[PDB]
Design a protein around this ligand. Structure first.
Ligand SMILES: [Rh+2]
Ligand SMILES: [Rh+2]
Length: 124
């Protein structure tokens, strides 16, 4: 089916835009990436960097993951990102999000061979 690596790309990668297309960005992107299908995914981050640059983080600063696993990695350089956060008045199926652009270090969890991002842990 959909690999963990492909799922990370669907849920977290948006290399096409340098920053959050618009105030509508999260409303459109959360739906189109199928993060609103079964429920409103409450929070989700999209990264506006090349796939190779995000895959390279698996080789960068090793940090503890929030769940206590050891396989998380923080980017040495800041990256362009968009945080999506479901609004207090959002009601499934009409999932509503606030769109916020940032330039932060990302923290991803990496797994497999090849060793690639499979979850988005945090930005700092
Ligand atoms: Rh820094
Ligand atoms: Rh700094």
């Amino acid at each position: 089916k959909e690999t963990a690596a492909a799922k990370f790309e669907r849920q977290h990668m948006d290399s096409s835009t340098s920053a959050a297309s618009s105030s509508n960005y999260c409303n459109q992107m959360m739906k189109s990436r199928n993060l609103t299908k079964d429920r409103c995914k409450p929070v989700n981050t999209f990264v506006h960097e090349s796939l190779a640059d995000v895959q390279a983080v698996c080789s960068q600063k090793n940090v503890a993951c929030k769940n206590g696993q050891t396989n998380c990695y923080q980017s040495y350089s800041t990256m362009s990102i968009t945080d999506c956060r479901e609004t207090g008045s959002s009601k499934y199926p009409n999932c509503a999000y606030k769109t916020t652009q940032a330039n932060k270090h990302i923290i991803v969890a990496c797994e497999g061979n090849p060793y690639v991002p499979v979850h988005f842990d945090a930005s700092v």
